[PDB]
């Protein structure tokens, strides 16, 4: 049978903690946003013609608008204060390991289980950074408040040389490194 | 911008099913089990840090349902267009023989929010120890969903994440093996 979907997204955007907050209440019907309330404006605005009658009707209700105009404080800032300690301030250091991958084996640096997602992984060869000989999976979200990424060194390992994977992340004050002695 | 908290909720007809969840920078804080009318925290510890009264979510869904019936009529009963998902199977960490790990089946970029997901190990449906997330939001308004299967690596096992969605003509199977 045909499907009909109604979606509502109430978004709270935070800039520098709760210094600047923007509240957006967005309505979607079958993937099409038709009307929204933006705290920067203070009233509902039709996104498509389908939302014109809705915005017009709701905007004539001062009581409703007054409630929505108070959400940046009563909803956004309130909730931020309630969850910030275990979300905004959540920090889980990454587990770093290096393993060879298949007559030569390229070195792969696995960086997993970390949070937040911002991270920088670099490869070094005997102290010199291999700035352009690296390929990665990019950032992978595990859907459980952790991320991971694989960073492979394209340079063929030479016996005698030392390769080091360096990881910088908000959870550590100095780079985490794993050395591989070829 | 630095952080975003999104309260995402939906109602779907004719399935008569709805969901309600909070998202922080892409991760779920909690959702409400509509059937049990209870608050489900994504990570157990969250429940000792905060509280949410599930009933509020139920009342919201009732309103979304009412809005849906109205908007469906105003849009000439035009049905939603199916967008098939892309599926990726990966492990949460590098695989090692006698060290437990977790297989992740990531279902992405689809709508409507309805899917059948099955884990198969050597052709056997696995329903032991598995877990999954509710339908998560995307900035493009499509959905994301994660399924998990803790396992013990073995050169003798093969795995498949079988996904069904109305946007697909046949089941989509993503294979994985050590």
């Amino acid at each position: 049978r045909p499907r009909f979907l109604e979606l509502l997204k109430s978004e709270c955007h935070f800039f520098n903690g709760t210094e600047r907050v923007r509240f957006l209440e967005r309505y979607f019907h079958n993937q099409e946003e038709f009307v929204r309330f933006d705290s920067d404006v203070g009233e509902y605005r039709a996104v498509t013609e389908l939302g014109r009658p809705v915005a017009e009707s709701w905007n004539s209700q001062k009581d409703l608008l007054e409630q929505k105009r108070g959400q940046v404080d009563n909803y956004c800032r309130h909730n931020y204060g309630v969850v910030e300690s275990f979300t905004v301030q959540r920090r889980v250091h990454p587990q770093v390991t290096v393993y060879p991958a298949k007559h030569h084996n390229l070195l792969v640096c696995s960086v997993s289980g970390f949070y937040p997602g911002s991270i920088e992984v670099r490869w070094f060869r005997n102290g010199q950074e291999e700035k352009t000989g690296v390929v990665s999976t990019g950032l992978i979200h595990n859907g459980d408040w952790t991320f991971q990424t694989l960073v492979m060194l394209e340079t063929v390992p030479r016996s005698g040389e030392v390769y080091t994977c360096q990881v910088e992340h908000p959870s550590v004050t100095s780079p985490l490194t794993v050395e591989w002695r070829a | 911008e630095e952080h975003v908290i999104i309260q995402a909720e939906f109602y779907l007809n004719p399935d008569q099913s709805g969901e309600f969840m909070f998202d922080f920078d892409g991760d779920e804080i909690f959702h409400v089990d509509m059937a049990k009318k209870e608050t489900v925290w994504r990570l157990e510890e969250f429940g000792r840090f905060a509280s949410f009264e599930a009933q509020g979510a139920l009342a919201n869904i009732a309103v979304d349902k009412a809005n849906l019936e109205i908007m469906t009529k105003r849009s000439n009963y035009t049905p939603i267009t199916n967008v098939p998902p892309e599926v990726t199977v990966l492990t949460n960490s590098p695989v090692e023989l006698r060290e437990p790990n977790v297989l992740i089946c990531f279902i992405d970029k689809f709508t409507p929010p309805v899917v059948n997901v099955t884990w198969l190990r050597n052709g056997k449906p696995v329903t032991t120890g598995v877990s999954e997330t509710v339908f998560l939001p995307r900035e493009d308004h499509l959905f994301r969903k994660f399924h998990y299967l803790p396992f013990l690596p073995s050169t003798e096992d093969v795995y498949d994440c079988r996904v069904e969605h109305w946007g697909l003509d046949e089941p989509l199977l993503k294979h994985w093996e050590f």
């Binding site: 509502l8 309505y27 009707s57 909730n79 | -």
Partner: peptide, 13 residues
């Protein structure tokens, strides 16, 4: 402590 929810506007029928 208490997470507060935002309520949907009711579209007129």
């Amino acid at each position: 402590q208490v997470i507060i929810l935002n309520h949907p506007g009711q579209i007129s029928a």
